[PDB]
Amino acid sequence: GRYIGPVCRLCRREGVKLYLKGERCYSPKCAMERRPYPPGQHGQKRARRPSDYAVRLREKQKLRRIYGISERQFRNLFEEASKKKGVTGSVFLGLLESRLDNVVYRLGFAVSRRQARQLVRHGHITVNGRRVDLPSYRVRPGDEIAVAEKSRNLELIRQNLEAMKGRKVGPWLSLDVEGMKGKFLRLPDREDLALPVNEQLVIEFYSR
């Protein structure tokens, strides 16, 4: 299961523009350009100084809600990252950025991660010429992520990937727009990502 329901309310609560909706959250409608205060009856009141715990929780929540994965899955990924070599922050973000749904969103086949999840699940995506329908699949440096032949005639995919013309993909990825495919060069770095997140807070949270 996941979180299904209102979304821009999370944009408001976090106080940042989390691009969770696709095209609306670019146009003057993201509900962060209007009412940038948290939701509810006591949204636009004076904010008290937040606790250390509050700050850490908010940072972790923001990071989790960007990728829209379970708290259990988030904890699992953190525990895996903390057990590996190198800086925990870098490794954790690398592991988060390797998810198949996220990779599809980065490639440009889908506009929102909530849409990439549906594309992957309903089966319109192959890795190394084999159908995979799980958003949580982890890709390694050097897999071909493509759209299935049976799914290339869809309006949705054509509109999505046609707009990628005159648009650049991330450095840690390569794309073939006319061939409708993509390549995972390597794991991304801290600076390759435009996250409004300081991972140090997330590290300090899961020590409590």
């Binding site: 106080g15 940042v16 095209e23 670019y26 146009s27 003057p28 962060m32 350009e33 209007r34 009412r35 940038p36 205060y37 636009q44 004076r46 904010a47 707009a163």
Partner: protein, 261 residues
Amino acid sequence: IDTNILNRIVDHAEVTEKTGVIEIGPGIGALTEQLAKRAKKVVAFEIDQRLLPILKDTLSPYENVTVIHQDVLKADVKSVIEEQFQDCDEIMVVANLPYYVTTPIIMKLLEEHLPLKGIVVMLQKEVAERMAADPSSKEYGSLSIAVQFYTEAKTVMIVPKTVFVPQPNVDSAVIRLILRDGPAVDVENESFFFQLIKASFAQRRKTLLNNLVNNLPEGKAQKSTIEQVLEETNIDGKRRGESLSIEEFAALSNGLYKALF
């Protein structure tokens, strides 16, 4: 914290001992004190019953202040100006607008064709480039067109987030609009002109032709007409729309309405 930012805003608004000013949402009257000190007779449109005593107490030692218990949108400001500023030369507008009713306020003020000299407002940076931009700016849109048609506008001051007493969520930009004597381009069918502008920017990813044809009730009917008109006007629909300007829009509007209006 607001100690000197207000003074800078008033300086940029360029008020003097003979200019009249309009205040919206005064609250306590942080800007109002400076305006009274520097400018001539002022006016306020407070609607909050709770903050009225505080505003009254703030403006007790001032004699050039008038307070109105009307909402800006509902009140016809033409009579307000003809009644209050009966001797003044230039009437400007200075206010800090409360997020939600910020675009409606500006639109209502501009659409009523006031004899205002101009406007200087403090709003969020978010919708600040959205109302002062250029072709291919990633912020070009309907709001930009409306503001840069009705008046001449450019962003002046960038107040960062870390200035206020309770830390807000968004950076702010004080914008100054010098009102324009005559509309930049002449359109007979102004309403459908505006709808055309909003149609070309219904979705910013699609091409202009597809935008125009897919956003009109008669769009299906006049596909050929739309195509021919965009072709003849030397500005084709094969572009996105964000790369156009006021001039191309004017020519295209003329093309549509001279032939189908």
